[PDB]
Amino acid sequence: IYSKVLVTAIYLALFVVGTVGNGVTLFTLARKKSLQSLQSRVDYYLGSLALSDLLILLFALPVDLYNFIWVHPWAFGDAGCKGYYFLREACTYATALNVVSLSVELYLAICHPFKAKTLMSRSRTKKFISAIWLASALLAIPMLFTMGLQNLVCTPIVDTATLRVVIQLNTFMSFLFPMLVASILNTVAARRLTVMVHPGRVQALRRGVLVLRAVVIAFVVCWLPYHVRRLMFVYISFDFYHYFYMLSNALVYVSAAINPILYNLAEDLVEDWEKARKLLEAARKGQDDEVRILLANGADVNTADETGFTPLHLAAWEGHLGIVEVLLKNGADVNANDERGHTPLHLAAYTGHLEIVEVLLKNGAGVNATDVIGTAPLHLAAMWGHLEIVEVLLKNGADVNAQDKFGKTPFDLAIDNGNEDIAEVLQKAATRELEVLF
Numbered sequence: 001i002y003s004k005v006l007v008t009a010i011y012l013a014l015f016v017v018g019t020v021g022n023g024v025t026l027f028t029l030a031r032k033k034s035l036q037s038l039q040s041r042v043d044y045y046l047g048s049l050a051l052s053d054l055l056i057l058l059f060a061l062p063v064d065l066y067n068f069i070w071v072h073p074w075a076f077g078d079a080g081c082k083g084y085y086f087l088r089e090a091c092t093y094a095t096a097l098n099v100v101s102l103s104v105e106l107y108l109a110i111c112h113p114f115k116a117k118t119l120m121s122r123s124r125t126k127k128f129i130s131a132i133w134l135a136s137a138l139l140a141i142p143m144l145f146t147m148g149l150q151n152l153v154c155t156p157i158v159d160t161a162t163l164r165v166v167i168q169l170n171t172f173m174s175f176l177f178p179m180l181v182a183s184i185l186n187t188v189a190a191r192r193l194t195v196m197v198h199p200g201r202v203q204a205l206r207r208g209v210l211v212l213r214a215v216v217i218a219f220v221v222c223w224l225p226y227h228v229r230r231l232m233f234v235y236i237s238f239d240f241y242h243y244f245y246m247l248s249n250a251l252v253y254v255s256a257a258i259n260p261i262l263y264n265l266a267e268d269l270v271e272d273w274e275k276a277r278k279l280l281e282a283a284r285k286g287q288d289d290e291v292r293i294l295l296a297n298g299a300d301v302n303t304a305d306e307t308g309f310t311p312l313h314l315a316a317w318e319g320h321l322g323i324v325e326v327l328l329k330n331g332a333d334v335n336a337n338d339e340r341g342h343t344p345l346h347l348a349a350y351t352g353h354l355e356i357v358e359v360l361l362k363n364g365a366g367v368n369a370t371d372v373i374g375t376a377p378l379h380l381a382a383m384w385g386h387l388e389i390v391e392v393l394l395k396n397g398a399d400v401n402a403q404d405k406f407g408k409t410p411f412d413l414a415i416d417n418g419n420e421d422i423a424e425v426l427q428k429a430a431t432r433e434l435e436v437l438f
């Protein structure tokens with residue numbers, strides 16, 4: 001009683017946010033104008049898959065929601081009968097060829113960049129996608145002859161042999177072949193790209209491969225069970241099949257409806273990650289030009305790596321004052337900690353960059369700040385033997401006696417590594433503390 005009503009609520013809900021979701025996606029990518037060519041041609045293939053997803057929701061779902069679900073006689077006529085399975089057939093090819101075409105174009109860009117330069121174009125892609133949608137429609141024409149009305153049911157109008165033949169050809173070159181081709185190229189290209197990686201066009205590639213990875217997986221998730229259902233008709237000849245048929249078909253509508261919401265959601269999340277990742281690399285590498293541009297875009301000043309290394313940790317460690325300066329200018333945290341519990345002041349004192357040590361303190365770095373090891377900036381300056389830094393550290397209220405978990409003072413470490421000059425400074429500095437205390 002409430003079962004049929006339960007599906008209605010879901011199937012109608014999928015139609016609303018699905019039609020709109022894909023609709024919004026089609027208008028979004030239309031107005032979109034990326035400077036990198038690959039970014040555009042990728043989004044033309046995404047826009048092509050959004051149409052395929054939209055057509056399925058507008059034409060097929062209503063026929064399913066009523067005849068297939070709600071009201072178990074055929075009420076759409078032979079024109080609508082042949083049309084339902086035509087459009088549904090046409091969308092599988094359209095989706096399949098796009099998934100392949102995208103992977104081919106994307107593969108070429110990575111593995112044959114110079115060959116691709118002479119071949120690929122926004123113009124040719126935009127045209128070629130029209131040719132896809134034609135071929136998709138032509139390959140779907142057979143299903144017009146393969147279906148008809150009978151006694152009132154839109155049942156097949158050809159032999160089981162000819163029916164088992166078309167589903168075989170359908171499932172082969174509208175799922176099996178494309179998945180196979182996409183999976184091979186998306187693996188060969190990915191391997192090449194991580195090797196090439198180990199800028200604008202290279203950024204578009206990293207995005208493009210990330211997209212195609214998400215596309216193919218999403219494509220395989222929903223269409224596999226659908227094509228598995230089709231495979232049954234070809235080969236197999238108790239009541240689980242009926243349950244599998246309904247779930248496999250329903251999954252297509254769910255995917256088509258949520259994918260635009262997901263893609264839009266995943267984009268923003270990965271965009272946040274990619275911008276943040278870019279800054280960490282840029283700060284460590286010393287490419288100040290990027291860092292300045294990345295900050296304006298809206299990258300998090302207090303991003304952290306797997307270790308817990310923020311831009312200020314990397315910039316101070318590598319010794320890029322220009323970056324350390326602009327990082328603090330864009331509200332970077334001077335007292336930020338990593339895994340071990342090192343502050344930028346630890347790493348600036350470690351490397352020995354005097355100017356950076358001064359700036360960190362001037363912007364309010366913790367001078368006695370201790371890590372889990374028990375070590376402090378003064379220990380690291382004495383350790384490496386930076387006689388200039390120990391001076392400016394001692395100036396800014398540094399605890400000379402402060403010992404670590406190894407029971408060693410900076411004066412001990414200074415004496416240990418036999419930096420005679422630096423060791424004499426701490427002795428005199430320590431004496432002053434006794435007079436100050438007394």
Ligand SMILES: COc1cccc(OC)c1-c1cc(C(=O)N[C@]2(C(=O)O)[C@@H]3C[C@H]4C[C@H](C[C@@H]2C4)C3)nn1-c1ccc(C(=O)N(C)CCCN(C)C)cc1C(C)C
Binds near residue numbers: 085155230233234238
């Ligand atoms: C041999 O076929 C199967 C074997 C095992 C599982 C299957 O699908 C889950 C199937 C199965 C596949 C299809 C199928 O592809 N149906 C079509 C399709 O939807 O793609 C339909 C009907 C024909 C014209 C077009 C194109 C296809 C063939 C629309 N229907 N169908 C199917 C589904 C349910 C029932 C059904 O209601 N049953 C009586 C289930 C009985 C199960 N006991 C045998 C245990 C019957 C079939 C066909 C055999 C006609």
